């Protein structure tokens, strides 16, 4: 496990990668459920780098109908919603260390547009240490980004039955290499992957959750297959065993046709993340960035797409990584059978 | 997540429904494992309502042979057993906020018998908020009770194979609608369901735990069927695959034929509880009232029934909700395929 | 300093002297400002003696006009006042361990009349260990009690100028030897002294606070003399230097003529208490029982006397110990120049 | 649940069984993640027995590549590694109460070399109370150890297809009955089982994880079978469904051929431990000693054998209990269909 | 006030001055009443210097007759007395950071004999920060130590009537400049002064506490004079007003003639310490090192001298600094009217 001294040093390293120095101000954003050791490590590491640092503490916001403790489960209002003064307090800093989770929200976007940069850090310290960020991680992720920005379509095939097509072009590419060095940009320690969004109303075909594939935030390995039929960018059919019924029931409950929209799509580039890690954690440990980021996955998602100006506000949100896939950009394979093949500069 | 401010206002709403005001005295009962945020919110809310308040702290009572941390799993003595002073400290109050989980005990019943009312509150704050009690919930549960109090039999059928008969009349009905407003009433925030007990040595037939059904306190969705054969009020056969072998081994561990007796039987009326919720929580989060209360389930139980004057004091205790059941009071259905149909007033 | 393990053992010893065993119930009374180490040691010691134990926690009560943090300085309402349910909660126990201080109030007396016995314990752990009670302290105090109950006058002379007469007989004797063994009786760990009250409207003469004598709760050694003139049981004159002006100003603040009434009078029998100890403590450490109890002092008091049925409810309260005094009961000296001389079996 | 007073009373009873009195010194070893109630209970109990007590606190050690929170996951370096002054601090004690877990590390065997005994105590208080150690547990475990010490081979069969042979002799027998009474010896509260290691490069055959069998630290009940093929002391093949693919992926992650070596083998003698208990716990509660100790299991293990002077220091370490087994010492059965049958004096009432 | 981050940075500075690096081991010694921010800062600073760090925690030791909370009140018995294993755990370290205070105990000198160095650090963080140790401080204190080493007698005089003579030679000179760099040596952060002990049974004359002079641990500025008459190394008379009566009462309470023995004597060399500081603190804040260290004071002491192998075990211990003195070594002044005049290189800038 990670001692307090090492946790502070880890934040020193990541904050320097994020260009924190004498001239920079740092706001550490927290609520009552924020890990106090990570808050303190971020405060002290910032002071050691001679930055001007303060904590902003917000009362927790609660969604009555949200279930479970995973913060990615209900994407709606946040503790910043309605509180313009607290938003101004964060916008006054060069960098925000977010230990309470704001991603996917319009207030985060307004803060980024002021040139403030944001580093989400909410996973447990030992996970933080296993995927401590590197410049080489950034360089590999950025090589993939060069390819993705030029692509006009993404395709996924798997021997389990995936056969999924998504025209591209309308939306930008987003990268996560684990530190917030550029102004006006968000990132998440830990990470190491990239994605974009399909053209409006255009994604089509079949995505098959094989035995062993994962739904977040359920955090289960599927023991029976789930087949998703997708037409015009929306899930229109969910078929299979018990997991299919559970998933159908869960999506039903939000009583909103927007929950079935396909949102972001991409592939993983983090070899220090592990498909097996989720089985070694309890559900309340965190959001399981291992499942999102592991090398050579195909990651897709459902629900809201307003963070790039899509139509859907809906709060129901799922992240679903697939193993053993082929991922093509136009006619070029970037992943073959779950292994990263292109571009060469992105492989580990 | 729920803020301290929100948690205190929630208790103000529930204590007010429970008729706490300046004429009343409130004891907040706790032990070392009680959630200090909930304790504090209850102390604070009671004072805001202008009641006189005090906390009573009991040493934790340990059952050597109980396994796991769920308090509903082993019903033996409690911290109140042989502690008449502590019991009178609770009887001095008009209402007890129970944050330590006094099992249904003879001492609990003698406290209720003096007119003191008891409100159980132990589920996590976010769960308390999702199922915040309402007067409408009480109306709908009372309408159902009216029909249950007159039934001479209850019957349960399912496509999966349940075919279960329970003569009634010997034992009363009991409701749980989330607050303790009448003298001598015990209730549980969150809840929203009702139940009774079969006449002695009388229940007959078959109860099938289908794929997706739940055993508490195991807190798993069954992946293979379990068939329970019942004769003269007792499980006599437990048949199936791994889950059944697990169940057989658990019940034999107590080395007591009383564990196989069917205890309470009833159905759920809480549309804000969710069959899917259990899979979003870890086991030590709480007892999963979502599983017990969700709208239209059939809930039956095994083990002790001394709380209604039955013969069985055994500690081993299971709560088992079933989906997709038809439930009949005499020859009228109250639930059809997991949906509440009667009384109309009880529906959501 | 005192470790946690030693503090529990000390409570074991004093609770045994207090006749706590498996037949006894113990209530540990606390509020937010109670020393948590002493609370826990009391709870754990009572559980080790196999008693039935619980804690009762009351919201703190605030006297708006009270100055400073000494709980003996404003004797009025307590947190028990108007909380009859919490009073019953305490009356249900055989012994109350008071860690929040109730002395001088009617609720404590009604608790004692039920047969409940009360042990105050609020001094620091190190002070509690320096004056750990013994049976031999009890025996010495009771020997002095036998003499005091027969006396019908008390007289004090000092070379510094005291010349004070108090007729006795109207009011009983009170002892404090450090543990609560007899039913319906209060005591204070630590102590070891005894007192009575003068006949109403009868105490007369002069009491001189010499250089080095003490006023509680001020907790100063006088550096200039204060002369108190007493006529018909009341101070009618306060003369001297800065300490006299300070004392005059402080008593006048309560705007109540009852503050000048002489209340309890007696002498100290604790040789493990020290007149020098006060100068080694900060004011918020405790109430300085060393100054009240030290061997051979004369201790008098002002203010309320309704704890024995006198006329005065007033909250202003002072405890003043004098050194080097001669103390006579009728014509026989029990203290000569600050040394205990009679009875012999009370000397140490 | 267990109150502070009872937890202190439990440590008094266990430390007394561990021969702690006024002549003994006790070191309570801890790090930041140690359960503070258990730390405090041991300190206080040792003081009430009038032993000379002190705590030793080490900064936590993190292995970058380790995953999840189970103490047995990464068995490599520890917070003691390279800290020889801290090691000597522990060696000064007669008994160390270990609340951070040094087992499977070289420094532990060196501390035991000096005559210090060590009691591991890391499971939740309620689990500690369910399996509060007893002298009769020690008597039954030692009767089993007699036979194990006399054996030249161990064999396992099961109806699911286990057919496994291990020559014995090279390595000693290790017992765990829950308290550390003898000098220079380690034990674990709770326990109640015994094991040894096979001769180097010699274990052979097949071990089948049947439905319901368990892999630690995964802490799952197998829902489909896994077949382990063993040759010359090493797993050479892992076959089955998803559980097998998960296991293969986990073991290859460490990129070290030594993770496939068979380590300790033995059987369970603790009837107060329960095969069903794991299902009532979350993963972070503890290491699940119920699964290791329950009466009549066959327990084998993979990876490191350095603690008895073996070849392998690898970090990846798995504990796998099997139900329903027949377990033989040479030609004589000690367990049949998961029930302890011999010696008679080892059986529970 | 001092933030957590700054407090860790101070311990980095002081531990480096104390020669802590990757080759060294550091034991942080504490009890329940140790300041936990200081404990944490020391542990963390030692780790960031890549020292091998551990904490050693002892159960607090209470002397029944001890009064008040000052750590110097009842000297002699410590939480270490009779705990040989804990003492060894401390001797395994190169440097002990002492946050519970062992000075004036026999165990401390034994630990130092093994080569372990000890740094006491118990004052509040703000006091630590105001007198953060420096190399120039060490330079000035050693300049003064050179003179004290060659002296055959110390004499004190003051207009208030001090006239005190102490033959020297039998005991060594002890220095305190704020950090523990040399092995086998103890120091105190904060400090900056030096002292020795008079030859056995030889101190003679009078010491007068003037108005404004201080008794520790009473922590009061004298408002009336106290006259101490001294013969053959022992106070034989204590005369004056209320302060004198309080002092006589306190010293006789211990019922032990050894409390009147004169112990260490010396002068203050720390200009960042302040005679006025004590009046801005409460009695439980700390031991008031300002009053012991301030520049030009004369500091003498009563009671124990066992820590340099003397006859006296007694627990009652008093620190008394005097202002406005002339202090002589043989016939040469080192302080005149409370200002430091020699050696020149020991004076403040
Ligand atoms: O009593 C009905 N059920 C509940 O509300 C929950 C737990 C329990 O006491 O059994
Ligand atoms: O890194 C992340 C984390 C959460 C999320 O929803 C997307 N990307
Ligand atoms: O022990 C005591 C304490 C306070 C007091 O006023 C009298 N006696
Ligand atoms: O008690 C234990 C615990 C872990 C292990 O590997 C063996 N024995
Ligand atoms: O630093 C100190 C403190 C106390 C003392 O007696 C000597 N030196
Ligand atoms: Fe997503
Ligand atoms: Fe039930
Ligand atoms: Fe009084
Ligand atoms: Fe193993
Ligand atoms: Fe001294």
From Swiss-Prot, chains A, B, C:
Keywords from the named record: Aromatic hydrocarbons catabolism, Iron, Metal-binding, Oxidoreductase
Reactions catalysed according to its record: 2,5-dihydroxypyridine + O2 = N-formylmaleamate + H(+)
Protein's name according to its UniProt entry: 2,5-dihydroxypyridine 5,6-dioxygenase
Keyword Transcription regulation: no
Enzyme class at the top of the EC tree: oxidoreductase
Annotated SUPFAM superfamilies: Thermophilic metalloprotease-like
InterPro entries cross-referenced by the UniProt entry: M29_Exopeptidase
GO molecular function, one term: metal ion binding
Cofactor: Fe(2+)
GO biological process, one term: nicotinate catabolic process
PANTHER family in UniProt: AMINOPEPTIDASE (PTHR34448), BLL6088 PROTEIN (PTHR34448:SF1)
Species the sequence originates in: Pseudomonas putida (strain ATCC 47054 / DSM 6125 / CFBP 8728 / NCIMB 11950 / KT2440)
Disruption phenotype: Cells lack 2,5-dihydroxypyridine 5,6-dioxygenase activity.
């Amino acid at each position: 496990p990670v001692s307090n001294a090492q946790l502070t040093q880890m934040f020193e390293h990541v904050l320097k990668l994020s260009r924190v120095d004498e001239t920079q101000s740092v706001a550490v954003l927290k609520s009552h459920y924020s890990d106090p050791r990570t808050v303190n490590a971020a405060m002290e590491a910032a002071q050691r780098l001679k930055a001007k640092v303060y904590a902003v503490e917000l009362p927790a916001f609660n969604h009555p109908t949200a279930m479970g403790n995973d913060m990615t489960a209900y994407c709606g209002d946040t503790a910043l919603t309605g509180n313009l003064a607290a938003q101004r307090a964060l916008e006054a800093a060069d960098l925000v260390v977010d230990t309470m989770m704001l991603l996917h929200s319009p207030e985060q976007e307004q803060i980024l547009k002021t040139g403030t940069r944001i580093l989400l850090a909410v996973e447990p310290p030992e996970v933080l240490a296993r995927m401590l960020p590197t410049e080489d991680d950034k360089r590999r992720v950025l090589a993939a980004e060069t390819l993705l920005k030029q692509a006009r379509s993404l395709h996924v095939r798997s021997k389990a039955g995936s056969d999924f097509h998504a025209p591209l072009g309308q939306y930008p590419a987003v990268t996560e290499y684990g530190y917030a060095d550029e102004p006006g940009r968000w990132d998440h320690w830990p990470s190491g992957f990239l994605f974009t969004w399909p053209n409006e109303d255009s994604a089509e075909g079949t995505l098959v959750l094989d035995v062993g594939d994962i739904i977040l935030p359920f955090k289960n390995y599927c023991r029976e297959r789930i087949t998703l039929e997708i037409e015009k960018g929306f899930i229109t059919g969910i078929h299979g065993g018990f997991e299919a019924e559970y998933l159908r029931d869960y999506m039903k409950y939000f009583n909103d046709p927007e929950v079935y929209g396909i949102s972001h799509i991409g592939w993983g580039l983090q070899p220090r993340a592990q498909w097996t890690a989720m089985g070694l954690h309890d559900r309340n440990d965190g959001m399981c960035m291992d499942a999102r980021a592991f090398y050579g996955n195909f990651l897709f998602s459902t629900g809201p797409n307003t963070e790039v100006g899509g139509k859907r506000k809906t709060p129901c949100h799922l992240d679903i990584p697939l193993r053993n896939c082929d991922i093509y950009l136009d006619d070029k394979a970037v992943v073959l059978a779950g292994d990263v093949v292109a571009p060469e500069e992105s492989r580990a």
